[PDB]
Amino acid sequence: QQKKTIAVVNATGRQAASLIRVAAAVGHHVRAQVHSLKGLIAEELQAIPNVTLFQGPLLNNVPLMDTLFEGAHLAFINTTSQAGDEIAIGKDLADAAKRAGTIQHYIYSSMPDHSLYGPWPAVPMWAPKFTVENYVRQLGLPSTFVYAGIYNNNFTSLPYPLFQMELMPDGTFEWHAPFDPDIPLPWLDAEHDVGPALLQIFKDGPQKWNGHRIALTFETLSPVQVCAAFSRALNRRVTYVQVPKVEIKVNIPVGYREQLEAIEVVFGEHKAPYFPLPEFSRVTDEARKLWSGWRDMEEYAREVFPIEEEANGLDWML
Amino acid sequence: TTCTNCFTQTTPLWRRNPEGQPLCNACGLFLKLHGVVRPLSL
Ligand SMILES: NC(=O)c1ccc[n+]([C@@H]2O[C@H](COP(=O)([O-])OP(=O)(O)OC[C@H]3O[C@@H](n4cnc5c(N)ncnc54)[C@H](O)[C@@H]3O)[C@@H](O)[C@H]2O)c1
Ligand SMILES: [Cl-]
Numbered sequence: 001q002q003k004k005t006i007a008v009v010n011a012t013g014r015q016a017a018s019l020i021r022v023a024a025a026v027g028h029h030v031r032a033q034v035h036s037l038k039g040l041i042a043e044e045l046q047a048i049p050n051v052t053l054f055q056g057p058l059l060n061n062v063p064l065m066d067t068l069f070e071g072a073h074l075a076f077i078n079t080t081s082q083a084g085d086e087i088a089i090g091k092d093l094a095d096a097a098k099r100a101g102t103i104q105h106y107i108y109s110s111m112p113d114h115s116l117y118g119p120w121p122a123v124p125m126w127a128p129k130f131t132v133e134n135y136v137r138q139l140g141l142p143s144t145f146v147y148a149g150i151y152n153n154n155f156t157s158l159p160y161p162l163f164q165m166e167l168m169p170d171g172t173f174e175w176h177a178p179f180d181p182d183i184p185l186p187w188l189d190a191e192h193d194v195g196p197a198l199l200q201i202f203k204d205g206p207q208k209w210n211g212h213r214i215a216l217t218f219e220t221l222s223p224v225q226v227c228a229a230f231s232r233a234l235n236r237r238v239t240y241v242q243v244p245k246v247e248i249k250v251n252i253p254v255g256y257r258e259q260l261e262a263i264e265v266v267f268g269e270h271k272a273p274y275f276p277l278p279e280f281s282r283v284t285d286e287a288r289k290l291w292s293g294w295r296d297m298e299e300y301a302r303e304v305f306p307i308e309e310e311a312n313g314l315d316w317m318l
Numbered sequence: 319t320t321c322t323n324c325f326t327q328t329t330p331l332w333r334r335n336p337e338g339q340p341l342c343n344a345c346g347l348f349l350k351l352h353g354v355v356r357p358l359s360l
């Protein structure tokens with residue numbers, strides 16, 4: 001009923017920003033930690049009225065966490081490895097949240113630890129989250145865990161890793177990834193659907209979701225099918241090409257490399273599920289039930305891809 | 319057609335604004351559930 005105050009970290013992150021825009025819009029007050037104030041997203045969030053920002057790093061910084069949860073009734077927590085040890089940060093955040101005592105619903109965005117389901121290795125930017133999930137549960141915080149699917153918007157023709165929908169000379173598009181071309185993977189339109197869904201979860205309350213794990217994915221497509229979607233949306237021919245490794249065409253930070261190499265082994269060699277957890281092994285049922293207005297890959301493909309490209313610096317759409 | 323809000327032309331179902339304006343599924347459903355127009359980025 002009443003609109004409560006929500007604590008969010010990594011405000012410029014796609015999941016958080018999506019939640020923040022819709023939350024502030026409907027009347028919720030937001031308190032969010034951002035690494036930097038400079039930036040398009042950053043600047044935008046600053047502009048939104050009831051959005052109070054706290055600039056500073058999360059790592060070994062309990063004073064910031066305490067402030068963040070002051071007067072906070074809800075919380076959506078999604079940390080990024082870039083900020084440092086996600087386990088130590090995720091645990092400090094949970095501690096502060098309980099220490100605040102006003103949190104009635106703590107939504108932690110989690111990810112699987114693949115080594116717990118097969119001879120597979122632990123994807124370094126995923127596994128750590130599963131540990132924090134356990135720690136949240138351990139404190140007794142009324143919580144809910146959401147597992148995000150692969151973002152539709154990771155796609156770009158630009159030379160960025162793993163999800164480059166490259167523009168070939170002959171005006172065609174080709175996407176090179178380790179993923180099996182036929183194995184359906186869970187996708188999610190972060191900017192379009194994370195916010196609405198999170199709101200619905202908060203509106204539902206812990207009375208329904210407490211302790212639950214929810215797969216935040218609204219559609220499952222294979223690398224080939226995703227390619228099909230782009231093709232019948234841009235009028236051009238798009239083809240998928242399974243490559244043993246991730247083509248790093250630019251200078252990426254060390255931590256992000258380790259991540260990809262792991263992705264290569266899990267999805268490239270072993271062809272393991274994105275969500276290897278038994279409860280997730282349709283997985284999209286809960287999400288669609290929480291939010292019926294999701295954006296599939298085709299709409300993303302036709303309505304957003306062209307637009308993001310142009311703004312990014314490309315004119316193949318003209 | 320075209321959503322009056324997000325301007326998308328691709329949507330699984332068209333809905334309407336209390337005034338008569340066409341909104342896509344998401345925007346229409348969002349306004350109905352939360353009371354305000356679906357905010358967009360940028
Ligand atoms: N991309 C996907 O498809 C996908 C799917 C499931 C889970 N995830 C998980 O999502 C998490 C990331 O969350 P997101 O998608 O909401 O964010 P994001 O990838 O959209 O971006 C995070 C933003 O925060 C900034 N940032 C955060 N800490 C920083 C620091 N210490 N120094 C400089 N910049 C910093 C980044 O540069 C960037 O602008 C990851 O842990 C990832 O494993 C991603
Ligand atoms: Cl941030």
Ligand SMILES: [Zn+2]
Pocket residue numbers: 321322323324325326341342343344345346
């Ligand atoms: Zn719309």
